[PDB]
Design a protein around this nucleic acid. Structure first.
Length: 51
DNA sequence: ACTGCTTTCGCATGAACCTCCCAACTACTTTTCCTCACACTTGTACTCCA
C-alpha cells in the first residue's frame, strides 16, 4: 500500500459512478493541497501516529 | 648546679572534594517500506537471390 493507493481506489469509485473527474482533476487537487494527500500523517491520526 | 620546655588552665546558660556522568549540538546508521528496468526468447513480420 502507498498514498498512490488511496488515489487509485478513489478513482475507481468515481469511474464506477461514471464521473467526468480524472487524474487530471486529482493531481490538481492534491498538488494544490486540497484533499489530505501530502503530510496526511502529520495532522490526522493524533494518537495512532506515536505507536 | 638552674638549667630549658612543658602544660594545664579558664564566667553561668542561652544560640551564635574530583573525576564522571549527564547535558546540549551535530552525523550517520538503522529497520523496514513501495516502485520499476533490465537482460533475453519465442514469435511475426519483413524481402530475398537462384
Amino acid at each position: 500500500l502507498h498514498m498512490t493507493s488511496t488515489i487509485s481506489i478513489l478513482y475507481l469509485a468515481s469511474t464506477h459512478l461514471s464521473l467526468p473527474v480524472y487524474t487530471c482533476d486529482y493531481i490538481k487537487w492534491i498538488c494544490t493541497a486540497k484533499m489530505p494527500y501530502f503530510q496526511a500523517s502529520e495532522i490526522l491520526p493524533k494518537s495512532w501516529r506515536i505507536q
